[PDB]
């Protein structure tokens, strides 16, 4: 479909990418929840700018022709009027990423991102060439663009009165593709039936309880009820990924964080639909439910297992989760919420 409602459009997620997300939600029978995507990242993701991983600490920029990108020069990031300590740590964040596979690429914008920037007011006009902006940074720096033979525009800048323009360098892919923000998943609520096989592979060897017994037993039933509890335990444990979450998972040399097997599947299935459209991988790590520095980001974009989407305050989010749990969808919450007095649960909550 591409965007069906106001929430879809407020999510910041590119329409084609969002279309795959809804398909994956239905195929894997799981509710997918996301933190909103910054609207300056939307177009970049859609035209194929790469997405950053957990290891990139450098700050993104929210202004100028570099909006949406992650500048090598921190003074070009959202950190523009900050103290010297700040820009100093940010400097290290940048060199750290470059030492670990990331590239420093010359920024060149597509014709379309250039139109978006101007239509959004990020760039208030130009010289055909010389750009203007009421952002405060345009008071310390000058920028201009130059069409390449590629049909793109190379971004150049200089410090007010430092006689020579130079390329705005931006952090990229180990393959040299510029990076923008990734899509942060807030939570993934899988239907419990997704774990029958997982459970049987653990307790049987993939067999139903009945077939396992027929095959290894002979001609109450205490053993049977005991195997049934064994499959219940195994399914619940795989549903919340008890063992998977004791370690970190990696994609090649990239730390993808703490993520359950099922959540990895989702990540992979979504990235897959993204390639199919013209995007790079868009989900680069696990869910906010395993983030040790949890945010209190007040609106969550939710796509149900049925494909319906909407935005929830988190008060509505508690009710939504309760309702979905009644339909057999599993939820486990960030382990720090209880202590922060921010639990999404209303049960006992302890041993």
């Amino acid at each position: 479909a591409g965007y069906a409602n106001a929430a879809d459009r407020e999510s910041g997620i590119p329409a084609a990418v969002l279309d795959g997300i809804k398909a994956v939600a239905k195929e894997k029978n799981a509710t997918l929840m996301f933190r909103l995507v910054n609207p300056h990242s939307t177009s970049l993701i859609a035209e194929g700018v790469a997405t950053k991983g957990l290891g990139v600490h450098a700050k993104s920029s929210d202004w100028g022709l570099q909006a949406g990108y992650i500048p090598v020069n921190p003074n070009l990031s959202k950190l523009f009027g900050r103290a010297p300590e700040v820009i100093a740590r940010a400097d290290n964040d940048v060199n750290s990423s470059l030492a670990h596979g990331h590239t420093a690429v010359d920024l060149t914008l597509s014709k379309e991102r250039l139109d978006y920037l101007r239509q959004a007011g990020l760039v208030t006009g130009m010289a055909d060439g010389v750009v203007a902006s009421n952002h405060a940074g345009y008071e310390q720096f000058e920028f201009r663009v130059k069409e390449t033979s590629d049909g793109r525009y190379a971004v150049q800048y200089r410090r007010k009165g430092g006689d020579d323009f130079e390329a705005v360098k931006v952090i990229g892919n180990a393959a040299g593709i510029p990076l923008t923000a990734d899509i942060d998943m807030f939570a993934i609520m899988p239907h419990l039936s997704n774990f029958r096989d997982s459970a049987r592979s653990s307790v049987t060897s993939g067999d139903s309880v009945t077939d396992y017994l027929a095959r290894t037993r002979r001609a109450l039933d205490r053993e049977r009820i005991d195997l049934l509890w064994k499959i219940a335990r195994a399914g619940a444990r795989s549903a919340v990924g008890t063992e998977a979450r004791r370690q970190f998972r990696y994609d090649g040399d990239m730390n993808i964080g703490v993520i359950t097997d099922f959540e990895l599947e989702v990540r992979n299935a979504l990235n897959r639909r993204a390639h199919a459209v013209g995007a790079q991988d868009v989900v680069q790590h696990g869910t906010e439910q395993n983030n040790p520095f949890p945010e209190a980001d007040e609106k969550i974009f939710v796509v149900s297992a049925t494909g319906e989407s909407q935005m929830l305050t988190r008060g509505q989010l508690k009710e939504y989760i309760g309702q979905q749990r009644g339909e057999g969808y599993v939820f486990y919450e960030n382990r720090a919420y209880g202590v922060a007095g921010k639990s999404l649960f209303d049960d006992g909550l302890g041993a």
């Binding site: 039936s193 774990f195 029958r196 509890w229 399914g235 008890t242 049960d347 006992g348 909550l349 041993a351």
Partner: protein, 69 residues
């Protein structure tokens, strides 16, 4: 050996409605999602098995013992 926060997360898969207890209805739901269509009698039997105190449901401490065998 699972931690307390680990057992609580699992308990939460069974306790669908959200009171700190697992009833026979909830367990039956867990079981066919997990591929085991059971009779009301079989379910009752699974609960009696974990129902140490005899009320007719599985509370958290009973669940802990069940999860440990």
């Amino acid at each position: 050996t699972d931690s307390e926060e680990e057992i609580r997360e699992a308990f939460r898969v069974f306790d669908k409605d959200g009171n700190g207890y697992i009833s026979a209805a909830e367990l039956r739901h867990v079981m066919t999602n997990l591929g085991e269509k059971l009779t009301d009698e079989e379910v009752d039997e699974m609960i009696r098995e974990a129902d140490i105190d005899g009320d007719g449901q599985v509370n958290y401490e009973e669940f802990v013992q069940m999860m440990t065998a």
